[PDB]
Design a protein around this ligand. Sequence first.
Ligand SMILES: NC(=O)c1ccc[n+]([C@@H]2O[C@H](COP(=O)(O)O)[C@@H](O)[C@H]2O)c1
Length: 252
Amino acid sequence: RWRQTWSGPGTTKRFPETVLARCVKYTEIHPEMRHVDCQSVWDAFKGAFISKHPCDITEEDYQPLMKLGTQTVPCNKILLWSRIKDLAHQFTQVQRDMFTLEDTLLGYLADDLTWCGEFDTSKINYQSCPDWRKDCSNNPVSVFWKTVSRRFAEAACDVVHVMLDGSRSKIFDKDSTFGSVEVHNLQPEKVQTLEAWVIHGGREDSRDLCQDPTIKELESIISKRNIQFSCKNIYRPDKFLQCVKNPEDSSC
Ligand SMILES: NC(=O)c1ccc[n+]([C@@H]2O[C@H](COP(=O)(O)O)[C@@H](O)[C@H]2O)c1
């Protein structure tokens, strides 16, 4: 066929087997998740979107999966990120200094995957799924990330860190998941400070991007929620990661 229903990539090939295998792998590694029944998780994940119109997904659809995937994360060691996931993941891999969303069972299960179903059949759609912009925002994937990111931000306390991509024209983007969901769901009763690490993409010598208009907007928004804001430039992310691996080495 030469034309698809939707404008987005279709469900990831072998989605069911992939989610299942990821759940097995995660529960084998992480002792606190040892008991989780991975069949049950698959079933709940399925139940959220199969036989439903993929432009009519709600957060409620994901509640059974959210329940099954309930997990304590050290509330003071949370790392959020925006449009810079590779560095964020490479960093937490070194010595588990912090935890991203993708370090949780549910973030781990869905990371890099696409999925959707069909109204009034129980089939997974492998040909196309709704594009957030062109088709609808209430699609299974977008609704999943909004739901899980909210819960992750609500769990944070003390100093929460965020890595931002200093090479984008909007270092802080109010339309991103970080800017539209996470920023507004940090609990001012619990969260003392949000500290941003602005990652330079500009090789060598560069500006103080903590002075960027979008960083000042983020400062203003956070400050107005009664949370302190701190910012730091990471001028050479390669050096940073080497310093994490081998601190007090030299030049760090
Ligand atoms: N792994 C993902 O694909 C994914 C998707 C949406 C949101 N998130 C969460 O939101 C942030 C990234 O989303 P944005 O790049 O849209 O800000 C991260 O803080 C993460 O906690 C992760």
